[PDB]
């Protein structure tokens, strides 16, 4: 087995995923239950995290649909200091980010385990700050909620970051 110069398989406790080879580990504690964080040091809005949290649920489906799940983890999307209505008349219409557009979601079953994935375009209060593309994949096993969230800014997304964000999240697998 030779080294891939683009994607790096990473094995953690109970999970594995592909991490971009040119990204580096981050010691920033961003979210509850964080066990991994990697970032593009030359654009830190490109980053990924793996979180492992306790949950009362048995399956990701116990949260409801992918859209329901997103509403229950919307702290992943932004750090707004208040719960607020967005200006959408449907879809994501309220939470802790100023604006969120759900682009797509999916419910892949892999090795007999139900995963959710959801892709969301966000903005904050100052629209002098660029929009972000955030992809969240998640599953539940053994009393734990496993989350992989990867993201990149709009411009970086269309200059190759898409591949890395979507690959990281879609590769995320729990034993």
Compute CA distances 117 → 15, 22, 23, 41, 135, whole Å.
16, 24, 22, 26, 7
| Burial environment of residue 63 by CB neighbours within 10 A (0 to 12, 13 to 18, 19 or more) | buried
Cβ-based neighbour number of residue 28 at 10 Å: 12
Residue 111, binding choice from Mn ion, Cl ion, none, Cβ under 5 to 8 Å by partner class: none
The DSSP-derived string for 26-64 is -----STTEEEEEEETTEEEEEEEEEEEE-S-SSGGGG-
Instruction: Work out what residue 87 binds among Cl ion, Mn ion, none; the CB cut-off runs from 5 to 8 Å by kind.
Output: Mn ion
Stretch that binds Mn ion, among 30-38, 58-66, 70-78, 128-136 (CB under 5 A): 128-136
Radius of gyration for the chain, computed over Cα atoms and rounded to the nearest angstrom: 16
Q: Which of 131, 141, 162, 171 binds Mn ion (CB under 5 A)?
A: 131
The runs of H, that is alpha helices, within 59-144 are 66-72
Select the residue interacting with Mn ion from 30, 43, 67, 154 (CB under 5 A).
154
Instruction: Decide whether 96 or 121 has the Cβ nearer to Cl ion.
Output: 121
Q: Are 117 and 169 in contact (CB under 8 A)?
A: yes
The Cα 33–Cα 70 span in angstroms is 17
Of 1-9, 45-53, 127-135, 140-148, which part binds Cl ion (CB under 5 A)?
127-135
CB nearer to Mn ion: give 132 or 144.
132
Which residues within the stretch 10-69 sit at the binding site for Mn ion (CB under 5 A)? Answer: none
Which string of x and - marks every residue 72-91 that binds Mn ion (by CB under 5 A)? ---------------x----
Q: Cβ 170 to Cl ion, closest distance in Å?
A: 20
121 binding Cl ion? (CB under 5 A) = yes
Residues that bind Cl ion (CB under 5 A): 121, 131, 154
Residues that bind Mn ion (CB under 5 A): 87, 131, 154
């Amino acid at each position: 087995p030779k080294k891939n110069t683009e994607f790096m398989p990473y094995n953690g406790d109970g999970f594995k995923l592909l991490v971009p080879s040119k990204w580096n580990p981050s010691k920033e504690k961003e979210f509850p239950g964080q066990v991994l964080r990697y970032e593009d040091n030359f654009d830190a809005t490109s980053n990924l995290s793996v979180l492992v949290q306790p949950t009362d649920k048995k399956s990701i489906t116990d949260f409801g649909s992918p859209e329901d799940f997103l509403s229950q983890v919307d702290y992943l999307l932004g750090k707004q200091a208040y719960f607020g209505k967005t200006d959408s008349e449907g879809g994501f219409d309220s939470g802790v980010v100023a604006s969120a557009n759900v682009l797509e979601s999916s419910t892949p079953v892999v090795d007999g385990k139900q995963y959710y994935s959801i892709t969301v375009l966000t903005r904050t209060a100052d629209g002098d700050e660029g929009g972000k593309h955030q992809v969240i994949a998640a599953t539940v096993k053994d009393g734990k909620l496993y989350i992989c969230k990867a993201q990149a800014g709009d411009k970086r997304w269309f200059k190759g970051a898409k591949k890395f964000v979507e690959s990281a999240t879609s590769s995320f697998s729990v034993a």
